[PDB]
Each structure stands twice: as structure tokens, then as C-alpha cells.
């Protein structure tokens, strides 16, 4: 209170990083806590130290409880009725004040409170800088090496932490080393907000490769997508906007130095450069690299497609574990598949045979005529009216009667939907035991009808693993329904 | 340290650091304080108990 408290509070390098009001409030709160510790009564007071004056005025708050205990710090309107009840019960406004506290025997407590306030100020600065800036997503030097954890200190008092899953499963970090991780969550932990990073997304790899790619730096080629996974897959691909540029060369960088640099940040996984194309059919093959151009598939409107490749390269192109398939799903904007050319040929033959069999029974034409009409192209005798007439009637001969397969189908759609709809009418018809059970979707009745279950006893006998075989309904929902049915059967004494 | 300006400068407690050197009872023995003597040279102002 002699033009010294404000000067002591204002460092202003680190202590006065925030406004002087915050530091004064923290110091006054510490002083009030020390005074309350020194005070015989367990009263609650708050102090305010003006920056201009420095005299910390302390006012004892009320915080009125709904009980009669501790009248100096908890009262109600019933007791205030003697004083005409000027204020309602439960008021937390200030109602008392203290002249001055000596704070002499409590010097150790004041020092402990000052240390706690310094820690709180460090945490506040961390929240003000790293949390407001979403941490420091940059390469740094680790300072603490805990069990499967690395804590690094950044500039401006910022800090970051690396989770166990965010690092390599086999590699362990040590203090003073380098850890690569993009901070995305500054959790407000005690004594500073340590940023949390996770190396499980392709964004970090794309950002690392973009800076070291001359095409990306000069904006000659723009990257449409990127795929990366720790331990599973990591590919770099950029698309040239008709600038006559090599996608593999742009993604690799200068003699592969960019890939080698990104490999360390990617958890030790090798970084490979793949091509990119605008056409999805070409884009799938481009993103399948390192491989050969043997997967070709197109779709009308859906994004689903098939992938065909040689037997030797069947694991390199996609792989049964997806070791490159996640690239084709991501770096191409199209569906991927892990199989050989034989599997695709068998699938196409099966689809053609199914279409021919359906058309034979749906058009009432002769078997040989239907086979001859359907062998010209895949799915020829299907959606004749919806598809253009140039495809369903390209061949000559019975061009006029080709529209009959759609004209009859338009009228017979009602009978066609009968097999889809009334199939459950006789075979396990729905009942209130399972179809009307609360907590399930509309597909539950169809699943019960197609599984042969009709009564709730069969569902109650089964558990969750047995019902988990159906992908439509999860094990938890079926288990909950079975438990509810069993409870109803047990306790149906009360309506 | 800035903690010094925070603690002793603001509060006015400019002693400012203290170390425990109290004449503790030697371990292993109980007792009852029967007589206490205070000898003060006549240069220092004696406290209330003196």
C-alpha cells in the first residue's frame, strides 16, 4: 500500500503477462486464504488489491446456506426476520469485511500459497498461449520421458505431450530427442495445459510433403487427397492441373529426400509416391501405385468399383490386410478391392448369370432367345426403360419387342414386390413379442422373421454373441431386447 | 527471484527467511517444565514474559 505492490506484481516479463488486475486478484486471493487459515473462525473472505493504490481491501462474503449452522458464514431469512429480513436466504453477496490481517505467524502458509499462485499463473499463461493457439504443432525437443510418454517444452511457456498410441509401438523416446506430432487438443491439465498429438491421420504427412514438394510450393500441381496410417499405409499423391507434371516426381520430391524426411514423422513407415488422376477409373489405378494398371471398373452412379491385378502384385497393389488399399480408398475417391483378376471375372460371370436367370423368368421368353439377348452385354435385360434405348436395343432383329420387358414390368411391379414383402406373412410372422419391443428399429422385425424366431422365449434363451452374427443388429441391442422380454415374462404380475 | 518480490516485498515481512533452531527436547526423555529462567543483558528490550 506504498506504491510497491503494483511494481512487484509488474515484472513485466513473465509475472505481468496478463493484465495487472489478474495478478493482483491472484495475490489477494492467496492473502485471503492465508488470513482465513490464520483466522480462528472458518469464514470465507475475498480480497481485492487495486493496481493504482495497492491496498488490498478484504470483504467477508456471506454464501448463505439453507441451514442455521455457522451464523457468521451461513444464515437464512428466518434468522434475518429479527432484522426484518432485508435480504433473502441463499444470497452469496458480501455482508462483512475485515480491517487488516497481520499475517506474521502464517508466513510459511503465505509462501506455500505464493508457490501455488505461481503454478496457477504458469498454467494460466499456458492456457492463454498454447490452448488459444491449439498448442505448438512443430518439431521440438523432448524434456521428460515417462512410461510410453514424451513431454516436450515449447516456446512462450507452451508444452506438449505425446500419447502412447501416438508413438511407434516398438520405438521408445528419451529426453532430449525429437518427437513429431501435430497438436490437436490442449487439455487443461494441472500446472500448464499439455498439448495432445496423435500420429494417425494423413494430414500431418500431407503437410510435411507439401512444403518439400517444389510443385506444391509453386502451386503447379494441387494435391486432391492423401492417405497415411501408422504401420498400415502411407502414400503421397498430387494432381497436376493440366500443367504437364509428374505426380510421382512431385510427391517424391528432390531425389526422394522428402519421402525420407516424412518417413521419420510417419512412425518409421516408408513413404511412397503414387500417381493421381482426375478420372476416377484412372484415379484408382494411379492411387494403387506402386503397382500396374490392371484394375478397371466403372459404375453408373454409385461410387463402388472392383479392382483386378496380377497374382504376384495382388498383395502390393491392395493387399489382404489393406497395406495399400487405404490409399485407393482415399487417394482416388473410389472404392477399392483386394482380389485377383479371377475373382473379378467370377463375380462378373455370376452377376451375368443371375441377370439372365431373372430375365428368363421375368420376360416369359424362350431360354435360348433370352440367353442370346443377354449375352451381348452385362445386365442388358434390366431397366430397359430407365437406361437409354441405344444400349438396350443396339442389336437389330427384335428391336420393337425389346420394350416389352419394361412395359410388362411396370404393371407387374406390384406382384414383383410381393416376394419381397409378403414372404414374412407365413414364415415367422411378426408378433408383439419381438416386433413391438421398444428400443429396436423397424429392421428388427424383418431380421426376426428371416431368422425363424417368432416367440420371445427363443430370443431370451439366446445371448449376445449368438445374435451378433447378423450385421444389421448389434449384440447390445439384441441382448437388451432379450433381457427386457425375460424381465417382462418374469414380472408380468403387475400390468 | 520474482517470488521474493511477490512475498516479502508486498507483504512487508522483510525478516525475511527463517531457519528452525529451536531447543527441542532430547529424544527418549519425558518431563515437566518446573522452572524457566530468563537472563537478559541490559541492552536489549525484554519481551512480555521477561
Amino acid at each position: 500500500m506504498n506504491k510497491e505492490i503494483l511494481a512487484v506484481v509488474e515484472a513485466v516479463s513473465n509475472e505481468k503477462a496478463l493484465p495487472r488486475e489478474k495478478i493482483f486478484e491472484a495475490l489477494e486471493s492467496a492473502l485471503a486464504t492465508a488470513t482465513k487459515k490464520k483466522y480462528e473462525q472458518e469464514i470465507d473472505v475475498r480480497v481485492q488489491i487495486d493496481r493504482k493504490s495497492g491496498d488490498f481491501d478484504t470483504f467477508r462474503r456471506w454464501l448463505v446456506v439453507d441451514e442455521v449452522t455457522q451464523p457468521t458464514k451461513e444464515i437464512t431469512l428466518e434468522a434475518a426476520r429479527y432484522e426484518d429480513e432485508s435480504l433473502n436466504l441463499g444470497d452469496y453477496v458480501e455482508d462483512q469485511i475485515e480491517s487488516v490481517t497481520f499475517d506474521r505467524i502464517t508466513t510459511q502458509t503465505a509462501k506455500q500459497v505464493i508457490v501455488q499462485k505461481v503454478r496457477e499463473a504458469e498454467r494460466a499463461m499456458v492456457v492463454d498461449q498454447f490452448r488459444e493457439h491449439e498448442g505448438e504443432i512443430i518439431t521440438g525437443v523432448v524434456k521428460k520421458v515417462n512410461r510410453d510418454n514424451i513431454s516436450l517444452d515449447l516456446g512462450n511457456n507452451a508444452e506438449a505431450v505425446i500419447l502412447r498410441e501416438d508413438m511407434l509401438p516398438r520405438e521408445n523416446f528419451r529426453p532430449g530427442d525429437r518427437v513429431r506430432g501435430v497438436l490437436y487438443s490442449v487439455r487443461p491439465e494441472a500446472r500448464g495445459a499439455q498439448l495432445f498429438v496423435t500420429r494417425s491421420k494423413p494430414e500431418m504427412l500431407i503437410e510435411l510433403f507439401r512444403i518439400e514438394v517444389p510443385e506444391i510450393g509453386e502451386e503447379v500441381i494441387e494435391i486432391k487427397a492423401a492417405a497415411r496410417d501408422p504401420g498400415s499405409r502411407a502414400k503421397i499423391a498430387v494432381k497436376t492441373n493440366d500443367k504437364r507434371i509428374d505426380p510421382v516426381g512431385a510427391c517424391v520430391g528432390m531425389r526422394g529426400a522428402r519421402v525420407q524426411a516424412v518417413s521419420t514423422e510417419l512412425g518409421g513407415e516408408r513413404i511412397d509416391i503414387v500417381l493421381w488422376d482426375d478420372n476416377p477409373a484412372q484415379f484408382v489405378i494411379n492411387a494403387m501405385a506402386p503397382a500396374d494398371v490392371a484394375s478397371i471398373v466403372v459404375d453408373e452412379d454409385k461410387h463402388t468399383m472392383d479392382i483386378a491385378v496380377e497374382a504376384g502384385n495382388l498383395a502390393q497393389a491392395i493387399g489382404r490386410n489393406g497395406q495399400n488399399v487405404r490409399l485407393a480408398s482415399q487417394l482416388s475417391g473410389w472404392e477399392l478391392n483386394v482380389m485377383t483378376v479371377d475373382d473379378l471375372q467370377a463375380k462378373h460371370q455370376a452377376e451375368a448369370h443371375a441377370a439372365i436367370d431373372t430375365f428368363t423368368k421375368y420376360l416369359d421368353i424362350d431360354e435360348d432367345f433370352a440367353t442370346v439377348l443377354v449375352e451381348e452385354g452385362f445386365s442388358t435385360l434390366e431397366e430397359l426403360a430407365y437406361v437409354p434405348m441405344k444400349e438396350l436395343l443396339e442389336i437389330e432383329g427384335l428391336d420393337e419387342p425389346t420394350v416389352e420387358a419394361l412395359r410388362e414390368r411396370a404393371k407387374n411391379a406390384l406382384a414383383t414386390i410381393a416376394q419381397a414383402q409378403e414372404e414374412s406373412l407365413g414364415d415367422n410372422k411378426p408378433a408383439d413379442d419381438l416386433l413391438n419391443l421398444e428400443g429396436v428399429d423397424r429392421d428388427l422385425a424383418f431380421k426376426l422373421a428371416a431368422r425363424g424366431v417368432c416367440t420371445l422365449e427363443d430370443l431370451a434363451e439366446q445371448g449376445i454373441d449368438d445374435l451378433a452374427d447378423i450385421e444389421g443388429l448389434t449384440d447390445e441391442k439384441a441382448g437388451a431386447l432379450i433381457m427386457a422380454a425375460r424381465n417382462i415374462c418374469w414380472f408380468g404380475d403387475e400390468a | 527471484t520474482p517470488e521474493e518480490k511477490l512475498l516479502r516485498a508486498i507483504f512487508g515481512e522483510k525478516a525475511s527467511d527463517v531457519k528452525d533452531s529451536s531447543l527441542r527436547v532430547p529424544n527418549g526423555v519425558s518431563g515437566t517444565v518446573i522452572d524457566v529462567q530468563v537472563f537478559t543483558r541490559d541492552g536489549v528490550e525484554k519481551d512480555k514474559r521477561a
Side-chain angles (χ1 to χ4, degrees), chain A residues 7 11 17 19 26 30 32 34 54 71 79-80 90 110 121 124 135 140 155 158 160 169 175-176 181 188 190 192-193 202 214 217 225-227 230-231 234 237 247 249-250 253 256-257 261 267-268 280-281 287 289-291 294 308 311-312 315 317 319 322 328 333 346 350 352 354-355 370 377 385 388 397 401 405 410 413 415 418 420 426 430-431 439 445 449-450 452 460 463 468 472 478-480 484-485 492 495, chain B:
Chain B
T1 61
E3 285 87 4
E4 288 191 356
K5 304 107 190 176
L6 168 68
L7 185 67
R8 49 96 185 168
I10 291 179
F11 287 169
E13 188 260 328
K14 288 173 171 54
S16 62
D17 200 1
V18 291
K19 176 187 170 177
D20 305 354
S21 296
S22 62
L23 183 63
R24 281 178 173 73
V25 172
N27 63 7
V29 298
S30 70
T32 306
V33 176
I34 54 171
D35 282 330
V36 61
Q37 315 315 120
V38 168
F39 303 152
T40 299
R41 176 220 297 261
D42 44 358
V44 178
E45 194 38 71
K46 51 188 72 65
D47 55 354
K48 305 176 301 307
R49 184 152 180 170

mmCIF file of all heavy atoms in Angstrom, chain A residues 108, chain B residues 17-24, unseen atoms left out:
data_model
loop_
_atom_site.group_PDB
_atom_site.id
_atom_site.type_symbol
_atom_site.label_atom_id
_atom_site.label_comp_id
_atom_site.label_asym_id
_atom_site.label_seq_id
_atom_site.Cartn_x
_atom_site.Cartn_y
_atom_site.Cartn_z
ATOM 1 N N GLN A 108 4.815 -19.204 6.517
ATOM 2 C CA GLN A 108 5.012 -20.427 5.742
ATOM 3 C C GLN A 108 3.798 -20.727 4.869
ATOM 4 O O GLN A 108 3.935 -21.119 3.704
ATOM 5 C CB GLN A 108 5.307 -21.599 6.678
ATOM 6 N N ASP B 17 13.847 -14.624 5.539
ATOM 7 C CA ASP B 17 13.990 -16.070 5.582
ATOM 8 C C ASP B 17 14.359 -16.512 6.992
ATOM 9 O O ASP B 17 15.138 -15.851 7.684
ATOM 10 C CB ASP B 17 15.054 -16.544 4.589
ATOM 11 C CG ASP B 17 14.908 -18.011 4.233
ATOM 12 O OD1 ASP B 17 13.970 -18.658 4.744
ATOM 13 O OD2 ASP B 17 15.733 -18.517 3.444
ATOM 14 N N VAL B 18 13.791 -17.638 7.413
ATOM 15 C CA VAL B 18 13.983 -18.148 8.763
ATOM 16 C C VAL B 18 14.388 -19.613 8.699
ATOM 17 O O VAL B 18 14.062 -20.330 7.748
ATOM 18 C CB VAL B 18 12.715 -17.975 9.628
ATOM 19 C CG1 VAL B 18 12.468 -16.503 9.922
ATOM 20 C CG2 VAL B 18 11.512 -18.590 8.932
ATOM 21 N N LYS B 19 15.111 -20.053 9.726
ATOM 22 C CA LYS B 19 15.555 -21.432 9.857
ATOM 23 C C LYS B 19 15.257 -21.918 11.267
ATOM 24 O O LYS B 19 15.501 -21.202 12.242
ATOM 25 C CB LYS B 19 17.055 -21.564 9.556
ATOM 26 C CG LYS B 19 17.619 -22.959 9.768
ATOM 27 C CD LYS B 19 19.130 -22.971 9.609
ATOM 28 C CE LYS B 19 19.722 -24.298 10.054
ATOM 29 N NZ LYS B 19 21.195 -24.348 9.844
ATOM 30 N N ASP B 20 14.734 -23.137 11.371
ATOM 31 C CA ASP B 20 14.336 -23.688 12.661
ATOM 32 C C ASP B 20 15.571 -24.093 13.455
ATOM 33 O O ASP B 20 16.338 -24.963 13.026
ATOM 34 C CB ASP B 20 13.409 -24.886 12.464
ATOM 35 C CG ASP B 20 12.206 -24.555 11.605
ATOM 36 O OD1 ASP B 20 12.031 -23.370 11.253
ATOM 37 O OD2 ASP B 20 11.436 -25.483 11.282
ATOM 38 N N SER B 21 15.761 -23.464 14.612
ATOM 39 C CA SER B 21 16.857 -23.790 15.518
ATOM 40 C C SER B 21 16.357 -23.820 16.954
ATOM 41 O O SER B 21 17.079 -23.465 17.892
ATOM 42 C CB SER B 21 18.012 -22.800 15.367
ATOM 43 O OG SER B 21 18.591 -22.887 14.076
ATOM 44 N N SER B 22 15.109 -24.240 17.142
ATOM 45 C CA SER B 22 14.523 -24.297 18.473
ATOM 46 C C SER B 22 15.182 -25.390 19.304
ATOM 47 O O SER B 22 15.546 -26.452 18.789
ATOM 48 C CB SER B 22 13.018 -24.544 18.379
ATOM 49 O OG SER B 22 12.744 -25.794 17.771
ATOM 50 N N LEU B 23 15.335 -25.124 20.601
ATOM 51 C CA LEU B 23 15.928 -26.090 21.525
ATOM 52 C C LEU B 23 14.899 -27.182 21.801
ATOM 53 O O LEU B 23 14.134 -27.143 22.768
ATOM 54 C CB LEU B 23 16.377 -25.409 22.813
ATOM 55 C CG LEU B 23 17.072 -26.320 23.827
ATOM 56 C CD1 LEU B 23 18.361 -26.883 23.247
ATOM 57 C CD2 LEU B 23 17.336 -25.591 25.136
ATOM 58 N N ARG B 24 14.874 -28.174 20.915
ATOM 59 C CA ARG B 24 13.960 -29.293 21.071
ATOM 60 C C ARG B 24 14.375 -30.169 22.248
ATOM 61 O O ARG B 24 15.549 -30.228 22.626
ATOM 62 C CB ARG B 24 13.909 -30.128 19.792
ATOM 63 C CG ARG B 24 13.045 -29.529 18.697
ATOM 64 C CD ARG B 24 13.066 -30.386 17.440
ATOM 65 N NE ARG B 24 12.117 -29.918 16.437
ATOM 66 C CZ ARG B 24 12.272 -28.824 15.702
ATOM 67 N NH1 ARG B 24 13.344 -28.059 15.817
ATOM 68 N NH2 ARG B 24 11.328 -28.493 14.826
#
